Ligand binder design. Structure first.
Ligand code: SF4
Ligand code: SF4
Lengths: 392, 393
């Protein structure tokens, strides 16, 4: 499914086609309030945000930054911070080399015939960059040209659809321009701010076709209503179902921006792109199966997994994604369970009393001990501790 | 951007490619209670729902149906009713003929089913065939699983259950047609639980049948999860131009009517430009072909007058929610950039004669930059509105 891309590390978090789709969010505090900004960053992480943006405007924004990181290091909380910038960000960065290092990525407006400086600064520091096209950063003569071009077409498009062309052109040109300065494909993420599902889908299918950059998906905004939730899912789902998009933000202006993370997290889970808890699946059963045993087994396993969880979670990162399969026949069980981390298949009609256990390959046959259940949880467990060990 | 299908009338409401997507809702009153159910179909309709499903299962409810329709008619509200039936289906219809005739669509899941296609072909009525889990032939599923195992790359057990469900939906379709029921009166569904599944199943059904498609997720309780999942599931399909009726199913707080799910279905349809809460005025962004900012304030005043006329247009002119009005920043490109507007005006940009064309599909007039412009255009809009919408055009 997934669009291949280079990997762009934002701090410790890999962003790109080979990696899990990340959730991003932003502060809502003025950054300058180190007290209220850091609180909000700690909890957005706990909420599910793996990366966190903050707007950085007057000088008062800057001094605050490196301290904010200086306490997160101590607060255990190892989050990557992203700096939201508008023109004058350079002189800001150039003045305080201390905060350029605290930031883990810069977010900048396009520029095409200050953009130069932002790119230059990032290449010195080794910092990745998101280039986010937007209405405000759009070449007026570009717009006019596109407008003229549109009116020559056999079937000219609407005003609004030309705007979207200009937005895409604006993002692609800035992308080529960052690369032209020497930035690096492993240092470059794109996006374009849109307000409607159709627009988002259309703009990002163009960005996919014309660039190899990882893509950060998001809608401009809406209030905390149903509208806002529905719009974001409506808009993100079609892209994520095609394999386009590497980072996602949900934006619903409301104390904090905390409900946004929930929603983003949900959109990912509805489409099976991230899990919060390990999962046991078992086949439906069909004609090959004699016995309810496989199904009682799966309920038991599932039950005993749901209680190892708060241990497993704190001991073993990534374990939320564990898939366990319990199948109803040996002849078809394994083939219907290829994608399980570990699965077992139970004898069916006219089958030997043996139960194969798979961990991608065959791991072992379980002879019909009464203990099959307990033997299997032991295997799930020894599988878990190996495959989900923290691996320095 | 839409799938071609035959047209299925459910009472007043047309359903298929050529028509706007309609939303089915559902009552949770004892159907037997004429006062409670009647009022609920009314609130469900008024929250914006064109089709209402009532539950008929006892003979006590059967004799309430014709009386439910009669009471809605006396309220002037002509919303079509749909019956779902427990097993007593065919029996209750042949026993209560006027209950049968008060319904407009029959729900069936794949004597039995045949004795229900029979009484629908005899009756002139449309049915929805809704495939589902407890309708899969246990033997087919076993067979499909065998086919799957023999594949160079077998799919997951769940992936096979979805094949069984499509096949089971396609078959019951093929069936009804053979039996003697028109493409005229056949709507198709196959409810599943998860977004990806829904997309895969209805792409299958879209490609393999020719039927109008009723898109819905299985029942889930109210929450972020449920709102999101139904948005995540319906959107990718409705973007692709698939589905002709939609239904969001969320479990309401105790004792309450199923109105919020109607609200979400409308928000889903709205978020994709498949439905409009209220008329809207659109204006170009301005480029380089104009330095005049007058088109914007005209658009602002045009939008500010329409918002003043809607409360009356609502109660007076049906359909007009969907009115699109264009106000453009230049004359040489204005008309082209405003083709999907019901009614459009284009102000002179740089170099242009002090003249502004109004369009309504075609060239209508050229309103001479008399200070009147705002009023003259605004007049032409009303001329249009009374002409297009209201009692049949
Ligand atoms: S694993 Fe075996 S028993 Fe289970 S659904 Fe598949 S073929 Fe049937
Ligand atoms: S209609 Fe005219 S002024 Fe308006 S955006 Fe298009 S070319 Fe530019």
């Amino acid at each position: 499914m997934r669009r291949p891309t280079p990997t762009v590390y934002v701090g410790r978090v890999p962003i790109g086609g080979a990696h899990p789709i990340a959730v991003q969010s932003m502060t809502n505090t003025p950054t300058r309030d180190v007290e209220a900004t850091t609180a909000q960053v700690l909890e957005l992480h706990r909420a599910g945000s793996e990366i966190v943006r903050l707007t950085v405007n007057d000088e008062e924004a800057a001094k605050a930054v490196p301290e904010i990181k200086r306490r997160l290091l101590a607060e255990g909380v190892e989050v990557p911070l992203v700096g939201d910038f508008h023109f004058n960000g350079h002189l800001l960065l150039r003045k305080y080399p201390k905060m350029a290092e605290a930031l883990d990525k810069f977010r900048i407006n396009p520029g095409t015939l200050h953009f130069a400086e932002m790119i230059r600064i990032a290449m010195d520091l080794g910092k990745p960059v998101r280039i986010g096209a937007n209405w405000g950063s759009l070449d007026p003569a570009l717009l006019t040209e596109l407008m003229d071009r549109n009116a020559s077409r056999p079937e000219p498009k609407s005003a609004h659809e030309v705007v979207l062309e200009a937005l895409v052109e604006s993002a692609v040109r800035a992308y080529e321009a960052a690369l032209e300065m020497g930035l690096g494909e492993d240092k470059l993420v794109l996006s374009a701010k849109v307000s409607k599902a159709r627009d988002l889908v259309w703009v990002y299918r163009e960005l996919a076709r014309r660039t190899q950059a990882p893509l950060h998906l998001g809608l401009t905004e809406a209030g905390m209503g149903v509208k806002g939730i529905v719009a974001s899912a409506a808009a993100l789902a079609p892209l994520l179902l095609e394999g386009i998009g590497d980072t996602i933000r949900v934006s619903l202006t409301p104390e904090p921006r905390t409900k946004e993370v929930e929603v983003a997290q949900e959109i990912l889970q509805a489409l099976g792109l991230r899990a919060f808890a390990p999962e046991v699946t078992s086949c439906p059963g069909c004609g090959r199966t004699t016995s309810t045993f496989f199904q009682e087994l799966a309920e038991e396993v599932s039950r005993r997994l749901k209680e190892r969880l708060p241990e497993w979670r704190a001991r073993y990162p990534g374990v939320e994604e564990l898939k366990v399969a319990v199948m109803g026949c040996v002849v078809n069980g394994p083939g219907e369970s290829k994608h399980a981390h570990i699965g077992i298949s139970l004898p069916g009609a006219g089958e030997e009393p043996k139960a194969p256990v798979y961990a991608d390959g065959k791991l072992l046959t379980i002879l019909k001990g009464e203990g099959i259940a307990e033997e299997f949880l032991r295997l799930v467990e020894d599988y878990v501790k190996t495959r989900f060990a923290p691996k320095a």
